[PDB]
Design a protein around this ligand. Structure first.
Ligand SMILES: Cc1cc2nc3c(=O)[nH]c(=O)nc-3n(C[C@H](O)[C@H](O)[C@H](O)COP(=O)(O)O)c2cc1C
Ligand code: SF4
Ligand code: SF4
Ligand code: SF4
Ligand code: SF4
Ligand code: SF4
Ligand code: FES
Ligand code: FES
Ligand SMILES: [Ca+2]
Lengths: 439, 225, 156, 226, 120
């Protein structure tokens, strides 16, 4: 599978020995060319407009367009202090893309930092990492030092008078830190409770200053747009969502990996033509398109293009586009129990519905797994799923938490009904009081 | 000069639609058994001729009553301290019919003149220690220090010294020193206060045996006991 | 009694030079103390609070909020296994059973010699090569229950 | 500003949020986390109302009245069926770990959670699993600590840190193991630590001086004084 | 537990008591008196008791010579057994920690998870 630079702008400079690309090898393979063009010939607002009309969308899972988000920055010249943050947390299960781009191609991330910080007029940039990526941390720090001693980082970058400083902030292992406002709160050294909007991070984000939070994949997509042009980027895929995307399947398949495809590729091609289909002796049961925080889909949804609108019309989220396949050998009750246990133990504890309803669903599913269900069980689960959607909770961790539960209840209700064995018994008897036998 | 206190609270003839204001809530309990250990006969309820409140629940404590004195916050469905939201015109603002209290004086149109009595700078003289007042929230008040609950929160009676003054006296932190004021020799242990100016000594006003009038006075024959 | 080392204080100051607010170096200060001493003792909260100028309350809240900061003493190695959804699909349960059979302890406990401490952890980002385990700084993929005691004998 | 609650028009201050504007009009809206002197943070998610986009809107959206500004021409509903169900559900979710301590608790009869459970109509329990527990702390001779009865409404930390600027009390823990208190056993250092006995809507912080010779609020002969 | 629900639920108001605490922290009435000259035997106190401590036995011979002897103090009310409810215990259900019952040892109570625990 050849990767020409025209159709694979992100991963065409990968090395076959799983070794990182350093500064000289990156610059030989057309490196820092979009950086040079943006810093020399383009105004920051021109770069923002180019990103806006190039159709680039956010790859963190929200699908928000980055040009529109960059247009929310204040035009006041009194607030020259500005921060640009990378959500290199990548703590969502089933997501392994940012590790792949930022363990063996850090100079692409550094170039995206420089370009976006010049376009946002950001005087500082941080990469909010995770504590479990040691090799990625070492590679990012080495690449940052190399770009510093090559004159691409620091004061008076390439004789343009723009001073940009890049830092790496290694996290301490909490899933809610992936949320952008909670990422800002964790960057300041507080407990990572997220923040309400409005105000957005663009108006007043990190330390009250204007701040732009972006994914690793989007900041890696930016220098390709700045180098090879905008009309090339619009012609990569003939879909509403433009540009290439890291998609791939995982879980009991022949080739669980990671590939770069244009948008609109149907989920069967990424399952059969790329992942090799499912493993020997295992037939297909379900799949998550976005990982742990999305709705399950059946076999009939495999012939669907992996776009935001197509999956959204199908009743789910594209997410990180890293699908996981579930065979029939795995019980749905056990899988949903594991998902809800992860989501309950990674709650931040700010707002009541998530904090004191995810453990309830955890206990209900644990009772279902051992066959200790009672009447009124699935009713309580769908009650929680109805009253944990968007808007009810403070942040979007709980809608993504209750998405797989309601999806597996809708599509696989017969497996949940098998665990209901015991009759309902909440109160033990008391000698000397006749109970109120409700009919 | 004290003519304002007539408007502080309404007199004892003030009634809300003919009735007085209740002191205790309407669900007050035990009325026929609080005094049963003394005698089973129910006594006369105490009559409050001085004020407009009554010593019973036969009164008015409605949130919409036209008054400024509220004995307690209670609304139907709000037994918490959140009944004050029902007792206000708007939440977080004033009371519904004005806050109690009347200003004794207004702002004068013309002010005073500049006080020319500029004091000279403090000179630490030998043998005399100027008393720096260290007030405490728990202990300085005359009545609050007599509370037995405050004695656990009561700080130990400690005298504060500059490091230079402590080095001059040869005393450390915690050792006992004795000083006499108005023919009263008392002994206290020592803390070392860094920010204190030298030539002074710090005393806790309102303590047991230490009057608050000692602030700004001079201390003689301070020595290690 | 806890007293911070000169190297720890120098690293904390060099880290707080990076941010505009000294509070932002709390996570890195706690991680530096954790790297130097294995875990974060009780006096470390007061020491980091006195260095950073922020109260000990929010430092303790940060140390208790994050799962990778240990407020209880652990063994010489911290074996963390991914209990998430994809490793459940790939069968981390056999790996956990093999770990409990070798170490003779439940997850969340430490071995009686202070050698290993077994803990479930979040997604390790290696779902395509699951199941995955994480000893102190090294991750391992494609785990089998029979290879667990061979893998754990290279950590003294 | 102009608002419409259940089709009835009201005139309110446009700068304030919907919760204090509606509580100024005498309307009953449940709330735990918001305090009049502390502002809105949207923690407890108890103040839910159903806001409609326009006059002829029937679907609406469940918003929080403490974080919703009382702008001109706002249309909200308090006693909507979905809003009432969600508020009862929030009360029930707070009830999944509340200990059976009301007879032996000083806040009984003065409890905001008691009035707030009775007000929402929640009286039937369908939680059969275990309830979490917490060890208490010695918070000095004034404040008695009982961490079991907390609902994680974050009033104590907000008041004690933002308002009173106290430095020895805070929140620790995680997802449902949040712990509100001092980092170690000792007296509370602030001079305004007595207001925690009424800032806390539950009986976590209680007046130990009153708890010695305790009696309920209906047994108190009260008076106004200085 | 001296919770004072019976005194306020009594429509005649013939109950008076005061709460006291032991060293372990359990709650008991310091004193407890009923004015039987005032009590109408309406049974509201037993209905409102959340610990089933106070009960109305099938006994009617309560006539007396003087009204002062109709006030029954705590010596004349505490009996040697559980009465009509033989196996109830409020402190087994209560969340408060008392002697012989630590935190989490009540009915449907998990063990206290410390915030310093290494488990996520
Ligand atoms: C619970 C939760 C976890 C999230 N985790 C991540 C993450 O790990 N990485 C990421 O890029 N976005 C994550 N997001 C999405 C962010 O809120 C936000 O979309 C991202 O930081 C930037 O979006 P972008 O793709 O437009 O750049 C998370 C959101 C939620 C609600
Ligand atoms: S939904 Fe609420 S409690 Fe849960 S992680 Fe988000 S803000 Fe925290
Ligand atoms: S202790 Fe009280 S004030 Fe603090 S969060 Fe809990 S219920 Fe709220
Ligand atoms: S604080 Fe808890 S135990 Fe006390 S009255 Fe309220 S709900 Fe009951
Ligand atoms: S039975 Fe007697 S003591 Fe009990 S509530 Fe009725 S009148 Fe009062
Ligand atoms: S007898 Fe029952 S109702 Fe009366 S105070 Fe004791 S426990 Fe409460
Ligand atoms: S689910 Fe285990 S590494 Fe991602
Ligand atoms: S009062 Fe609005 S969410 Fe708490
Ligand atoms: Ca009088």
């Amino acid at each position: 599978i050849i990767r020409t630079p025209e159709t694979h702008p992100l991963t065409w400079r990968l090395r076959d020995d799983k070794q990182p690309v350093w500064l000289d090898e990156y610059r030989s393979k057309n490196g820092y060319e979009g950086a040079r063009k943006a810093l020399t010939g383009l105004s920051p607002d021109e770069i923002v407009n180019q990103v806006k009309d190039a159709g680039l969308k956010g790859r963190g899972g929200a699908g928000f367009s980055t040009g529109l988000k960059w247009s929310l920055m204040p035009k006041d010249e009194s607030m020259n202090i500005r921060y640009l943050l990378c959500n290199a947390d990548e703590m969502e299960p089933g997501t392994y893309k940012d590790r792949l781009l930022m363990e063996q191609l850090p100079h692409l991330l550094v170039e995206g930092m420089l370009i976006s910080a010049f376009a946002l007029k950001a005087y500082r940039g941080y990469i909010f990492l995770r504590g479990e990526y040691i090799e990625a941390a070492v590679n990012l720090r080495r690449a940052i030092a190399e770009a510093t001693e090559a004159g691409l980082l620091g004061k008076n970058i390439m004789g343009t008078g723009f001073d940009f400083e890049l830092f790496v902030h290694t996290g301490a292992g909490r899933y809610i830190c992936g949320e952008e406002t909670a990422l800002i709160n964790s960057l300041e050294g507080r407990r990572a409770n997220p923040r309400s909007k409005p105000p957005f991070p663009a108006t007043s984000g990190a330390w009250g200053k204007p701040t732009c939070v972006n994914n690793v994949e989007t900041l890696c997509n930016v220098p390709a747009i700045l180098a090879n042009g905008v009309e090339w980027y619009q012609n990569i895929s003939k879909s509403k969502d433009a540009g290439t995307k890291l998609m791939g399947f995982s879980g009991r398949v022949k080739n669980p990996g990671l590939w770069e495809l244009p948008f609109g590729t149907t989920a069967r091609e990424i399952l059969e033509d790329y992942a090799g289909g499912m493993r020997d002796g295992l037939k297909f049961k379900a799949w998550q398109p976005g990982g742990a925080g999305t709705d399950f889909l059946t076999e009939a949804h495999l012939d669907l293009p992996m776009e935001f609108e197509s999956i959204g019309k199908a009743g789910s989220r594209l997410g990180t586009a890293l699908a996981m396949a579930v065979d029939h050998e795995i019980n749905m009750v056990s899988l949903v129990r594991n998902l809800e246990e992860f989501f309950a133990r990674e709650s931040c504890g700010w707002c009541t519905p998530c904090r004191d309803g995810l453990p309830w669903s955890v206990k209900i599913l644990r009772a279902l797994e051992r066959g200790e269900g009672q009447p009124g069980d699935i009713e309580t689960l769908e009650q929680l799923c109805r009253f944990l959607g968007p808007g009810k909770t403070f942040c979007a961790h709980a809608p993504g938490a209750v998405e797989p539960l309601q999806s597996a209840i809708k599509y696989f209700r017969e497996e949940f009904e098998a665990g209901i064995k015991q009759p309902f018994s909440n109160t033990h008897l008391i000698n000397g009081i006749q109970p109120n036998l409700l009919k | 000069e004290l003519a304002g206190i007539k408007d502080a609270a309404p007199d004892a003839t003030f009634r809300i639609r003919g009735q007085k204001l209740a002191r205790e809530p309407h669900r007050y309990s035990g009325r026929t058994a609080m005094r049963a250990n003394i005698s089973v006969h129910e006594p006369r309820q105490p009559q409050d001729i001085d004020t407009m409140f009554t010593f019973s629940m036969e009164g008015n404590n409605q949130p919409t009553a036209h008054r400024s004195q509220v004995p307690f916050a209670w609304a139907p469905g709000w037994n918490s301290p959140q009944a004050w939201n029902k007792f206000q015109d708007e939440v977080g603002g004033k009371l519904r019919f004005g806050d109690p209290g009347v200003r004794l004086f207004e702002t004068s149109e013309n002010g005073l003149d500049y006080f020319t009595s500029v004091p000279a700078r403090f000179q630490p003289q030998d043998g005399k220690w100027r008393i720096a007042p260290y007030y405490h929230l728990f202990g300085s008040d005359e009545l609050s220090q007599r509370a037995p609950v405050f004695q656990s929160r009561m700080p130990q009676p400690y005298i504060k010294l500059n490091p230079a003054d402590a080095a001059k006296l040869g005393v450390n932190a915690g050792t006992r020193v004795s000083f006499s004021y108005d023919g009263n020799t008392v002994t206290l242990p020592v803390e070392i206060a860094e920010g204190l100016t030298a030539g002074q000594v710090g005393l806790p006003m309102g303590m047991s045996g230490i009057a608050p009038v000692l602030a700004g006075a001079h201390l003689e024959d301070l020595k290690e006991a | 009694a806890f007293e911070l080392s000169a190297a720890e204080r120098e690293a904390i100051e060099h880290e707080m030079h990076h941010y505009e607010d000294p509070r932002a170096a709390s996570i890195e200060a706690l991680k530096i103390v954790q790297k130097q001493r294995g875990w974060v003792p009780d006096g470390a909260i007061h020491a980091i609070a006195d260095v950073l100028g922020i109260p000990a309350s929010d430092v303790e809240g940060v140390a208790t909020f994050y799962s990778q900061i240990f407020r209880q003493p652990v063994g010489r190695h911290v074996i963390r296994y991914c209990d998430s959804v994809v490793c459940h699909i790939n069968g981390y349960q056999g790996i956990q059973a093999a770990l409990e059979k070798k170490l003779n302890i439940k997850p969340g406990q430490t071995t009686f010699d202070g050698r290993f401490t077994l803990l479930p952890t979040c997604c390790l980002g290696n779902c395509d090569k699951g199941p995955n385990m994480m000893i102190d700084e090294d991750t391992h993929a494609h785990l089998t229950p029979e290879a667990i005691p061979e893998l754990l004998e290279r950590y003294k | 500003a102009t608002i419409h609650v259940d089709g009835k028009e009201y005139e309110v201050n446009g700068a304030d949020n919907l919760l204090e504007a509606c509580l100024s009009l005498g309307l009953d809206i449940p709330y735990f986390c918001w305090h009049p002197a502390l502002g809105s943070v949207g923690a407890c998610r108890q103040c839910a109302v159903k806001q409609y986009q326009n006059a002829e809107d029937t679907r609406g959206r469940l918003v929080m009245s403490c974080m919703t500004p009382a702008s001109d021409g706002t249309f909200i509903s308090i006693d909507d069926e979905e809003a009432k169900q969600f508020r009862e559900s929030v009360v029930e979710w707070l009830m999944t770990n509340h200990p059976h301590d009301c007879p032996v608790c000083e806040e009984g009869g003065n409890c905001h959670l008691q009035d707030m459970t009775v007000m929402t109509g929640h009286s039937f329990r369908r939680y059969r699993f275990t309830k979490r527990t917490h060890r208490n702390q010695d918070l000095g001779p004034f404040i008695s600590h009982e961490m079991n009865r907390c609902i994680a409404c974050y009033r104590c930390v907000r008041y004690y840190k933002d308002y009173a600027d106290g430095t020895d009390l805070g929140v620790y823990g995680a997802h449902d193991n949040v712990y509100f208190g001092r980092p170690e056993d000792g007296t509370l250092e602030s001079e305004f630590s007595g207001n925690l006995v009424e800032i806390c809507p539950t009986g976590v912080f209680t007046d130990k001086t009153h708890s010695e010779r305790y009696n309920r609020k209906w047994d108190m002969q009260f008076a106004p004084s200085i | 537990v001296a919770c004072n629900l019976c005194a306020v639920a009594c429509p005649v108001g013939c109950i008076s008591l005061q709460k006291a605490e032991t060293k372990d922290g359990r709650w008991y009435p310091e004193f407890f008196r009923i004015n039987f000259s005032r009590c109408i035997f309406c049974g509201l106190c037993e209905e409102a008791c959340p610990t089933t401590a106070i009960q109305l036995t099938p006994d009617f011979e309560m006539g007396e010579y003087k009204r002062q002897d109709l006030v029954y103090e705590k010596e004349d009310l505490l009996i040697s057994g559980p009465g009509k409810y033989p196996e109830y215990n409020f402190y087994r259900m209560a969340g408060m920690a008392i002697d012989g019952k630590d935190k989490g040892e009540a009915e449907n109570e998990a063990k206290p998870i410390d915030v310093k625990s290494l488990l996520p």
